[PDB]
Amino acid sequence: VQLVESGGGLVQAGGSLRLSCVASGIPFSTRTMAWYRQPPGNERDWVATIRSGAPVYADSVKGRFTVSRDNAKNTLYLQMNSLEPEDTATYYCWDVNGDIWGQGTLVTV
Amino acid sequence: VQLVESGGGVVQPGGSLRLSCAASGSIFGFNDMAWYRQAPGKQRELVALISRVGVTSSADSVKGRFTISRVNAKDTVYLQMNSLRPEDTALYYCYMDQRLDGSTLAYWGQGTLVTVS
Amino acid sequence: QVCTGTDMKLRLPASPETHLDMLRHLYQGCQVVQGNLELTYLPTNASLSFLQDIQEVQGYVLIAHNQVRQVPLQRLRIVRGTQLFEDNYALAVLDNGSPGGLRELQLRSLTEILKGGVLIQRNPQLCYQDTILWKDIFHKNNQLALTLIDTNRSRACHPCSPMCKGSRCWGESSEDCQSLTRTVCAGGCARCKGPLPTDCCHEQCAAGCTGPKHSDCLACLHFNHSGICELHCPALVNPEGRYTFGASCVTACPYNYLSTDVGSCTLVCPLHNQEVTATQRCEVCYGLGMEHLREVRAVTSANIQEFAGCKKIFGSLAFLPESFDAPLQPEQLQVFETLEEITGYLYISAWPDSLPDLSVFQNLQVIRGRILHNGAYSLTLQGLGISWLGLRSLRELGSGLALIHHNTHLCFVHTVPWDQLFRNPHQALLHTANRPEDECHCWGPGPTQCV
């Protein structure tokens, strides 16, 4: 059981990015997935959470981020738009039910 | 300081058994923990000794079969016995030590009976 | 004045966004910690002014994975060492970290450690650890008195103030001098306040003294009896009899404790004893972690039938994702319909998708919380996808905090009288990442869910 994040990298201010989290060995259909960000020198911060319907977003990223999942591909997406210089952080993939953390990906704006 | 063993019993040859001995009345820990056994008619001989750091010793006649472990939080000794032989019948006494004011104080249990047959 | 610690050794916080809030709720205005002090995963600019009143820790102190530059524990006096980190250490400072990370320990009041050692490894910014005489802080009768100090650094530390008699310091300030109470004693007294024979302390005083009597010392070696250090609490068989509670003698046992005929306040009855409700004393179904299911961590189909037709469980109930995938079925959960009291905690991290609520616990009334999940929580609900709670008969939460997070479809969270359920000024409801209340006293929809 492991989670792998990919799709990060570099982008300019006001750009866009798409993240991907893949799960192998777990029943991805019956799990709750959450996105997190870790700015340097600070604590992990919640971003969004989705289980089966309309996801719940944080007040900081509401209206700019969209979170979707594909059960057939066992993948979880995170679409980023209108990026800001305060959005630079290491983004983590979390399995809420199984308590499985991803390794994280670096995003710099 | 009082020591109580709760491990003895009767086992068929080739079976397994586990002995435990917890202590009460101490707020400082113990120096080292040991297990002794007494076959009928003979004196008390060391079976296994464990240091406070975790160094483990054992008798030449039980090597590869007897394992000793301790838990400092509960002040407990353990002795896992595997492939018990008929000559393993003895009276097993747990032993504890404490270094106080430059001297070592010994504490003995009441003993437990293990018969292999 | 007395609070309960936690047991989450080196583990990531259950809720990253509420970790500091839970720490503040647990340790606000507390002098004696009945457990382990675990300060972990603290950000760079974390405010920790709520820990300034802590004076004694019963278990061990664990400071790990912290980006704080200073941890303000300057009134802590003694660590009992009842519990040990990795079974060897009473104090542990590991992997902490202006680049960030703690720079000084600042434990100028700590004087006595009854049992255990010190572990200080991998602190790049920490200074003044090799200059502290750790033999002085260990009790003269301490058996596991070992030290393992890693002095690898990424910066150069200034020398401490010249006001110190030697070079032993807890920091750069002049008032961070280390006080010696063991190696400077006259004669054989274990503790003293000076080099004279008359400066030795009473035999029942642990961390030092202000006078030669047994009523004017900083800590009690065994028990505190209304300001008197005594080896044993007064016996009950007696108008002056007192109960044993931690390291002090009390008139009556606390709210959520069991009074034994021996004269001590415990959280579980001993062998061949039965709990009697009058307060409760020690004059049956066993849950997870109680003498038959100690190693079991979930309620599966192989042990669900043990709770059939039961009204009180002596243990906890955990519902892991592995419980439902033989996988557990929704029809098998009805065995808890008659349950009314849980001695431990209630953990639900998974639930069938066909159940819109927790109605299988309709008749549950008390969650005692004598055993807490991670040492801090007695009711946890995460990643469930339930529409409402439905715990209609719940009235009391004996101890611990309530954590309900990441339930994207959960409403009616704030329609519950949570303050009426708590019986301590240390319990609170931590909730995040639920369904927004804009789109959302009762437990659910309908007239039958009223409180």
XYZ file of C-alpha atoms in Angstrom:
677
model
C 0.000 0.000 0.000
C 1.506 3.295 -1.144
C 0.528 6.681 -2.562
C 2.570 8.543 -5.183
C 2.149 12.216 -6.085
C 3.186 13.621 -9.458
C 2.580 16.567 -11.753
C 4.291 19.327 -9.771
C 7.268 21.441 -10.834
C 7.617 25.164 -11.518
C 5.164 27.818 -12.698
C 4.918 31.607 -12.799
C 2.541 33.831 -10.853
C -1.039 33.552 -12.061
C -0.372 30.258 -13.847
C -2.000 26.847 -13.657
C -1.017 23.351 -12.563
C -2.521 19.878 -12.248
C -1.594 17.304 -9.606
C -2.133 13.552 -9.553
C -2.137 10.971 -6.757
C -2.176 7.233 -7.500
C -3.037 4.381 -5.128
C -1.858 0.780 -5.487
C -3.042 -2.074 -3.282
C -6.019 -0.369 -1.600
C -9.750 -0.175 -2.478
C -9.646 3.375 -3.843
C -13.412 3.409 -4.461
C -14.284 3.104 -0.743
C -11.725 5.589 0.621
C -11.733 9.281 1.526
C -8.928 11.358 0.008
C -7.583 14.680 1.290
C -5.075 17.162 -0.131
C -2.577 18.963 2.099
C 0.126 21.602 1.686
C 3.244 22.172 3.813
C 4.802 25.622 3.417
C 8.454 25.665 4.509
C 8.913 26.214 8.228
C 5.201 25.729 8.986
C 2.737 22.917 9.702
C 0.721 20.866 7.236
C -2.355 22.743 6.009
C -5.604 21.257 4.727
C -6.618 21.989 1.132
C -9.581 19.854 0.060
C -11.351 16.566 0.768
C -13.596 14.386 -1.407
C -15.260 11.016 -0.836
C -18.152 10.512 -3.289
C -19.765 13.833 -4.263
C -19.145 17.555 -3.944
C -15.724 18.062 -2.312
C -15.123 20.439 0.587
C -12.530 23.171 0.043
C -10.605 25.384 2.432
C -11.527 29.059 2.618
C -8.157 30.107 1.173
C -8.368 27.970 -1.987
C -12.147 28.058 -2.489
C -13.101 29.145 -5.998
C -9.632 28.626 -7.499
C -8.996 24.901 -6.942
C -11.040 21.970 -8.228
C -10.659 18.411 -6.937
C -11.823 15.345 -8.864
C -11.208 11.603 -8.683
C -11.221 8.672 -11.108
C -12.128 5.395 -9.411
C -11.374 3.240 -12.466
C -7.826 4.605 -12.756
C -7.348 4.666 -8.946
C -6.188 8.277 -9.263
C -7.023 11.539 -7.504
C -6.578 14.902 -9.219
C -5.991 18.459 -8.017
C -6.446 21.189 -10.631
C -4.790 24.501 -9.750
C -5.706 27.844 -11.319
C -4.859 31.497 -10.648
C -1.801 30.526 -8.625
C -0.353 32.988 -6.117
C 3.116 33.445 -4.581
C 1.672 32.228 -1.258
C 0.746 28.862 -2.831
C 4.317 27.497 -2.855
C 4.370 24.408 -0.629
C 4.909 20.658 -0.630
C 1.595 19.012 -1.532
C 0.686 15.708 0.123
C -1.843 12.973 -0.634
C -3.625 11.501 2.393
C -5.914 8.489 2.768
C -8.238 9.469 5.610
C -9.730 6.045 6.350
C -6.533 3.995 6.109
C -4.232 6.712 7.513
C -1.760 6.502 4.625
C 0.347 9.547 3.736
C 1.959 10.263 0.390
C 5.579 11.215 -0.139
C 4.697 14.692 -1.397
C 5.489 16.841 -4.424
C 7.095 20.278 -4.604
C 5.206 23.191 -6.179
C 6.911 26.576 -6.591
C 5.120 29.649 -7.927
C 10.178 -5.031 46.886
C 8.282 -8.267 46.216
C 8.551 -10.708 43.302
C 5.811 -13.058 42.061
C 6.034 -15.699 39.315
C 3.015 -16.736 37.228
C 4.480 -19.088 34.638
C 4.699 -22.677 35.838
C 2.715 -25.658 34.670
C 2.879 -29.151 33.194
C 3.875 -29.620 29.545
C 4.458 -32.589 27.268
C 8.009 -33.049 25.925
C 8.715 -30.872 22.911
C 6.140 -28.298 24.014
C 6.473 -24.611 24.800
C 6.072 -22.546 27.958
C 6.499 -18.915 29.002
C 7.343 -17.632 32.483
C 6.845 -14.113 33.834
C 7.826 -12.401 37.087
C 6.739 -8.847 37.923
C 7.933 -6.690 40.813
C 6.257 -4.124 43.053
C 7.397 -1.510 45.542
C 10.104 0.224 43.487
C 10.165 3.685 41.912
C 13.738 3.494 40.579
C 13.953 0.335 38.453
C 16.248 -2.654 38.804
C 19.892 -3.322 37.992
C 19.574 -6.721 36.312
C 17.066 -9.559 36.023
C 17.788 -13.286 36.000
C 16.160 -16.716 36.018
C 17.376 -19.596 38.185
C 16.250 -23.217 38.272
C 16.624 -26.013 40.825
C 16.494 -29.645 39.745
C 15.550 -32.191 42.442
C 18.425 -32.551 44.884
C 20.737 -29.930 43.345
C 21.615 -26.357 44.131
C 20.147 -23.183 42.206
C 21.862 -22.519 38.870
C 21.598 -19.511 36.571
C 19.484 -20.082 33.454
C 19.503 -16.645 31.807
C 20.667 -13.165 32.815
C 19.825 -9.819 31.203
C 21.498 -6.491 31.937
C 19.760 -3.132 32.245
C 21.179 -2.060 28.874
C 19.883 -5.239 27.238
C 22.837 -7.627 27.142
C 21.528 -11.196 27.327
C 23.306 -14.268 28.704
C 22.203 -17.894 28.893
C 23.335 -21.254 30.230
C 25.143 -23.665 27.918
C 22.445 -26.343 28.325
C 19.549 -24.137 27.154
C 21.233 -22.140 24.387
C 19.004 -21.862 21.331
C 15.860 -22.751 23.305
C 15.578 -20.300 26.233
C 15.146 -16.562 25.637
C 14.996 -13.842 28.297
C 13.508 -10.362 27.906
C 12.597 -7.538 30.269
C 10.272 -4.532 30.319
C 11.608 -1.646 32.398
C 8.249 0.159 32.459
C 6.527 -2.735 34.256
C 9.635 -4.208 35.966
C 8.924 -7.657 34.533
C 11.078 -10.559 33.362
C 10.158 -13.111 30.715
C 11.476 -16.548 29.799
C 10.227 -18.233 26.624
C 10.913 -21.979 26.683
C 10.771 -23.927 23.413
C 11.266 -27.658 22.793
C 11.209 -28.560 26.477
C 13.127 -31.724 27.416
C 12.552 -34.114 30.343
C 15.670 -32.755 32.085
C 14.080 -29.280 32.129
C 11.984 -30.262 35.168
C 13.025 -27.959 38.017
C 11.893 -25.100 40.260
C 12.262 -21.784 38.425
C 13.041 -18.703 40.533
C 13.094 -15.168 39.158
C 15.839 -12.865 40.403
C 16.217 -9.084 40.574
C 19.039 -6.783 41.634
C 19.460 -3.192 42.798
C 22.666 -1.203 43.314
C 22.095 0.986 46.381
C 24.767 2.918 48.310
C 27.569 0.951 46.663
C 26.062 -2.471 47.432
C 23.784 -4.860 45.547
C 20.523 -6.028 47.128
C 19.136 -9.356 45.918
C 15.431 -10.179 45.670
C 14.074 -13.692 45.144
C 10.707 -15.067 44.104
C 8.780 -17.934 45.641
C 9.487 -20.242 42.702
C 7.382 -21.927 40.043
C 7.206 -25.622 39.166
C 7.641 -26.830 35.579
C 7.375 -30.579 34.961
C 8.025 -32.058 31.512
C 6.230 -35.367 30.950
C -4.151 21.577 38.327
C -3.918 17.900 37.341
C -4.250 16.798 33.712
C -3.749 13.625 31.685
C -0.999 13.334 29.084
C -0.974 11.548 25.742
C 0.549 8.451 24.119
C 1.359 9.152 20.453
C 5.108 8.410 20.409
C 6.749 9.795 17.236
C 3.401 9.509 15.419
C 1.983 12.143 13.102
C -0.908 14.171 14.559
C -4.377 12.763 13.955
C -5.561 16.208 12.813
C -2.676 18.460 11.690
C -4.768 21.644 11.857
C -6.005 21.069 15.437
C -2.834 19.683 17.057
C -1.887 22.969 18.735
C -5.495 23.565 19.801
C -5.689 20.103 21.378
C -2.367 20.681 23.158
C -3.627 24.010 24.520
C -6.930 22.474 25.638
C -5.133 19.600 27.376
C -2.376 21.604 29.092
C -3.985 24.981 29.872
C -3.516 25.807 33.550
C -2.029 22.430 34.508
C 0.627 21.879 37.177
C 0.961 18.070 37.351
C 0.805 15.861 34.253
C -0.514 12.347 34.933
C 1.130 10.733 31.939
C 3.639 11.641 29.245
C 4.387 15.161 28.008
C 4.562 14.833 24.209
C 5.273 18.128 22.417
C 5.632 17.177 18.751
C 5.180 18.859 15.359
C 5.126 22.485 16.529
C 5.521 25.185 13.838
C 8.155 27.927 13.888
C 5.909 30.651 15.358
C 3.836 28.472 17.690
C 2.689 30.126 20.920
C 3.230 27.750 23.851
C 2.417 30.021 26.796
C -0.059 27.442 28.152
C 2.763 25.104 29.263
C 4.318 27.625 31.677
C 2.452 26.199 34.699
C 3.573 22.565 34.315
C 5.650 21.465 37.309
C 5.663 17.639 37.440
C 5.403 14.879 34.828
C 4.512 11.337 35.885
C 5.654 9.612 32.690
C 8.239 10.830 30.181
C 8.869 14.054 28.267
C 9.096 13.737 24.474
C 10.090 16.756 22.367
C 10.476 15.662 18.750
C 10.004 16.952 15.193
C 9.501 20.553 16.333
C 10.249 23.744 14.410
C 9.773 25.904 17.518
C 12.925 27.754 18.537
C 12.160 27.619 22.276
C 9.880 25.391 24.352
C 8.954 27.280 27.568
C 9.313 24.647 30.291
C 11.091 26.631 33.005
C 8.964 25.594 36.005
C 9.151 21.816 35.505
C 10.796 20.321 38.589
C 10.715 16.504 38.470
C 10.026 13.653 36.049
C 8.800 10.505 37.791
C 9.642 8.168 34.922
C 6.697 5.822 35.462
C 6.568 5.391 31.681
C 9.699 5.367 29.532
C 10.290 6.228 25.883
C 11.678 3.139 24.121
C 11.639 1.555 27.613
C 14.905 3.321 28.491
C 14.516 7.109 28.515
C 12.543 9.599 30.599
C 13.565 12.624 28.494
C 13.786 12.465 24.695
C 14.752 15.301 22.327
C 14.953 13.963 18.762
C 14.949 15.330 15.207
C 14.026 18.927 16.063
C 14.651 21.227 13.106
C 16.916 31.682 11.487
C 16.853 28.218 9.889
C 14.462 26.812 12.489
C 14.491 24.211 15.222
C 14.930 24.595 18.958
C 18.125 26.329 20.067
C 18.067 25.918 23.860
C 16.380 23.489 26.232
C 15.854 26.036 29.046
C 15.013 23.586 31.828
C 16.539 25.614 34.669
C 14.059 24.209 37.218
C 14.420 20.492 36.416
C 16.413 18.868 39.209
C 15.239 15.277 39.696
C 14.563 12.284 37.456
C 13.433 9.257 39.452
C 13.668 6.590 36.730
C 14.980 6.646 33.166
C 17.648 8.323 31.097
C 18.183 11.162 28.613
C 18.112 10.876 24.812
C 19.209 13.898 22.746
C 19.825 13.070 19.073
C 19.865 15.025 15.798
C 19.201 18.623 16.880
C 21.145 20.858 14.458
C 20.430 24.166 16.227
C 20.468 22.965 19.853
C 23.216 24.188 22.179
C 24.261 23.675 25.811
C 23.611 19.948 26.133
C 27.170 18.705 26.742
C 27.756 21.236 29.547
C 24.924 19.988 31.794
C 25.941 17.612 34.594
C 23.268 14.976 34.036
C 24.515 12.885 36.973
C 23.189 15.599 39.299
C 19.683 15.448 37.810
C 19.483 11.658 38.215
C 18.368 10.371 41.600
C 21.100 8.645 43.592
C 19.008 5.443 43.574
C 18.171 5.658 39.859
C 18.921 2.298 38.245
C 18.458 3.152 34.545
C 20.574 6.324 34.734
C 22.162 6.453 31.282
C 22.752 9.327 28.869
C 22.982 9.411 25.060
C 23.771 12.967 23.924
C 24.450 13.840 20.279
C 26.376 17.122 20.045
C 26.429 17.490 16.250
C 25.642 21.104 15.378
C 25.200 23.388 12.379
C 26.068 26.622 14.225
C 28.426 28.040 16.845
C 27.061 28.786 20.318
C 28.170 31.715 22.438
C 29.435 30.925 25.947
C 26.857 31.385 28.674
C 27.017 34.179 31.231
C 30.048 34.342 33.564
C 27.651 34.393 36.541
C 27.698 30.584 36.656
C 30.090 29.043 39.166
C 31.245 26.644 36.460
C 30.334 26.368 32.769
C 27.044 24.483 33.235
C 24.119 26.359 31.693
C 20.682 25.768 30.184
C 20.998 28.806 27.924
C 22.800 32.039 27.171
C 21.029 34.150 29.810
C 22.470 34.773 33.266
C 19.475 33.148 34.995
C 19.968 29.911 33.012
C 22.618 28.755 35.477
C 22.406 25.106 36.521
C 21.793 24.406 40.211
C 23.471 21.361 41.770
C 21.653 19.537 44.576
C 23.321 16.088 44.554
C 27.087 16.274 43.977
C 27.518 19.164 46.453
C 25.771 17.457 49.382
C 27.531 17.026 52.721
C 27.634 13.457 53.987
C 25.264 10.858 52.563
C 22.096 12.913 52.067
C 20.660 12.431 48.582
C 19.399 16.022 48.259
C 20.574 19.284 49.787
C 20.328 23.056 49.443
C 23.965 23.772 50.314
C 27.366 22.317 51.207
C 26.703 22.268 54.967
C 25.515 19.138 56.809
C 22.511 21.117 58.081
C 21.535 21.940 54.474
C 20.442 18.391 53.617
C 16.771 17.777 52.858
C 14.227 15.449 54.417
C 14.353 11.808 53.347
C 10.875 12.092 51.776
C 11.697 15.086 49.539
C 12.674 14.367 45.940
C 13.770 17.403 43.915
C 15.200 19.647 46.651
C 14.142 21.653 49.660
C 13.951 25.116 51.178
C 14.150 23.896 54.779
C 15.150 20.821 56.793
C 11.526 19.874 57.525
C 9.317 17.575 55.437
C 6.809 20.347 54.653
C 9.084 22.845 52.844
C 10.557 20.928 49.904
C 10.004 21.347 46.177
C 8.637 17.838 45.561
C 7.432 14.762 47.432
C 9.366 11.550 46.822
C 6.347 9.271 47.338
C 3.182 11.152 48.357
C 2.003 14.656 49.268
C -0.412 14.860 52.214
C -1.769 18.432 52.321
C 1.764 19.813 52.134
C 3.474 16.963 54.024
C 5.781 14.504 52.256
C 4.843 11.027 53.503
C 5.984 7.561 52.457
C 2.446 6.144 52.714
C -0.973 7.754 52.594
C -2.929 7.340 55.853
C -4.798 4.049 55.990
C -8.569 3.895 55.600
C -8.956 1.386 58.452
C -10.245 5.884 59.996
C -11.556 9.462 59.909
C -8.110 10.588 58.685
C -7.905 7.973 55.932
C -7.008 9.266 52.474
C -7.073 7.688 49.025
C -3.960 7.326 46.876
C -4.149 9.304 43.616
C -0.874 9.600 41.727
C 1.646 11.119 44.142
C -0.802 12.747 46.557
C -3.297 11.732 49.239
C -6.889 12.814 48.596
C -10.101 12.673 50.605
C -12.154 11.218 47.735
C -11.353 9.705 44.360
C -11.779 11.894 41.246
C -14.917 11.918 39.108
C -13.939 9.199 36.604
C -11.949 6.850 38.855
C -12.631 3.659 40.804
C -11.924 3.531 44.540
C -10.299 0.290 45.690
C -10.637 -1.238 49.145
C -6.841 -0.949 49.387
C -7.175 2.839 49.332
C -6.070 3.907 45.852
C -7.863 5.520 42.913
C -7.531 3.327 39.814
C -9.060 3.232 36.338
C -9.783 -0.526 36.289
C -10.835 -3.059 38.903
C -8.233 -5.652 39.964
C -8.514 -9.413 39.575
C -11.478 -11.192 41.196
C -13.157 -7.824 41.793
C -16.434 -6.343 40.561
C -17.266 -2.685 39.982
C -20.145 -1.475 42.171
C -22.059 1.751 41.513
C -23.329 3.690 44.528
C -19.134 7.215 42.539
C -18.008 3.646 41.841
C -15.823 1.220 43.786
C -14.141 -2.142 43.202
C -15.825 -4.393 45.766
C -18.763 -9.521 31.608
C -18.110 -8.440 28.028
C -14.519 -7.399 27.326
C -13.736 -4.933 24.552
C -10.553 -4.336 22.614
C -7.464 -4.137 24.794
C -8.801 -5.821 27.967
C -7.079 -9.110 28.777
C -8.594 -11.175 25.956
C -8.448 -8.786 22.988
C -5.325 -6.878 24.023
C -3.622 -7.294 20.636
C -6.850 -6.961 18.617
C -7.175 -3.545 16.979
C -10.510 -3.785 15.135
C -14.011 -5.230 15.405
C -14.113 -7.876 12.664
C -16.470 -10.729 11.816
C -14.324 -13.118 13.891
C -15.133 -11.373 17.195
C -18.363 -9.404 16.637
C -20.477 -12.186 18.181
C -18.720 -11.673 21.531
C -20.715 -8.443 22.003
C -24.148 -9.960 21.322
C -26.745 -9.138 23.966
C -24.423 -6.917 26.005
C -25.199 -3.747 27.954
C -21.723 -2.690 29.147
C -18.355 -3.259 27.457
C -15.137 -3.285 29.491
C -12.955 -1.891 26.738
C -12.990 0.094 23.508
C -14.535 -0.280 20.046
C -12.495 0.467 16.912
C -13.911 0.228 13.377
C -10.955 0.246 10.985
C -11.303 0.022 7.188
C -10.019 -3.568 7.395
C -13.109 -4.483 9.443
C -15.445 -4.172 6.437
C -13.153 -5.750 3.820
C -14.989 -12.413 5.889
C -15.884 -8.720 5.636
C -18.315 -7.303 8.174
C -21.905 -6.774 7.060
C -24.378 -3.996 7.942
C -26.843 -6.569 9.300
C -24.273 -7.808 11.837
C -23.918 -4.370 13.469
C -27.292 -4.689 15.242
C -25.623 -6.573 18.119
C -24.726 -3.146 19.569
C -28.366 -2.013 19.790
C -28.453 -2.968 23.490
C -25.111 -1.326 24.322
C -25.355 1.468 26.894
C -21.860 2.070 28.327
C -18.319 1.902 26.940
C -15.457 1.907 29.437
C -12.900 2.910 26.785
C -13.151 4.995 23.628
C -15.204 4.753 20.431
C -13.194 4.871 17.195
C -14.945 4.788 13.806
C -12.719 5.397 10.771
C -14.915 3.321 8.437
C -18.620 2.642 8.007
C -20.936 0.947 5.480
C -22.104 3.263 2.715
C -25.693 2.002 3.091
C -25.962 3.359 6.653
C -26.798 7.100 6.640
C -26.116 7.466 10.383
C -24.694 5.811 13.508
C -28.109 4.500 14.595
C -26.640 1.145 15.683
C -25.467 3.043 18.798
C -28.946 4.436 19.459
C -29.046 3.271 23.090
C -25.441 4.174 23.954
C -25.543 6.568 26.908
C -22.057 6.884 28.451
C -18.597 6.768 26.901
C -16.439 6.594 30.017
C -13.157 7.320 28.247
C -10.975 5.638 30.862
C -8.813 4.485 27.936
C -8.256 7.086 25.220
C -7.277 6.643 21.582
C -3.728 8.022 21.243
C -4.129 9.082 24.885
C -6.281 12.108 24.011
C -9.536 11.113 22.255
C -12.611 9.191 23.393
C -14.789 9.661 20.279
C -13.337 9.884 16.761
C -15.251 9.976 13.461
C -13.248 10.544 10.266
C -13.931 9.794 6.604
C -17.375 8.286 7.180
C -19.670 9.949 4.647
C -22.628 9.906 7.055
C -25.481 12.396 6.853
C -26.144 12.757 10.597
C -24.875 11.360 13.889
C -27.967 9.806 15.463
C -26.466 9.216 18.929
C -29.794 9.989 20.565
C -29.120 8.533 24.030
C -25.593 9.897 24.544
C -25.406 12.104 27.642
C -21.892 11.980 29.127
C -18.303 11.933 27.875
C -16.295 11.002 30.953
C -12.858 11.992 29.670
C -10.952 12.864 26.523
C -11.721 15.034 23.519
C -14.174 14.552 20.654
C -12.709 14.647 17.137
C -14.987 14.747 14.081
C -13.215 15.663 10.843
C -13.224 14.944 7.096
C -16.894 13.891 6.965
C -17.906 15.674 3.762
C -21.624 14.817 4.113
C -22.060 15.333 7.872
C -24.522 17.949 9.135
C -26.080 18.493 12.590
C -22.619 18.590 14.190
C -23.303 21.930 15.906
C -26.910 21.046 16.831
C -25.624 18.825 19.666
C -25.161 20.096 23.269
C -21.497 19.127 23.445
C -20.790 21.273 26.516
C -23.428 19.357 28.489
C -21.691 16.074 27.598
C -18.304 17.067 29.057
C -17.416 16.709 32.743
C -14.034 18.458 32.755
C -12.526 21.845 31.823
C -10.201 20.005 29.446
C -12.605 18.448 26.904
C -13.662 20.059 23.636
C -15.014 19.228 20.188
C -12.439 19.507 17.395
C -14.118 19.566 13.982
C -12.690 20.392 10.554
C -13.339 19.616 6.884
C -16.998 18.708 7.426
C -19.926 19.732 5.252
C -20.229 23.548 5.356
C -22.877 24.771 7.779
C -24.196 27.307 5.251
C -25.347 24.443 3.017
C -26.496 22.339 5.997
C -30.620 20.672 20.124
C -31.014 17.489 18.079
C -29.041 14.568 16.664
C -30.642 14.371 13.213
C -33.665 15.082 11.028
C -37.124 14.303 12.327
C -38.977 14.743 15.619
C -37.462 11.586 17.156
C -33.894 12.968 17.168
C -34.530 15.746 19.699
C -32.160 15.945 22.659
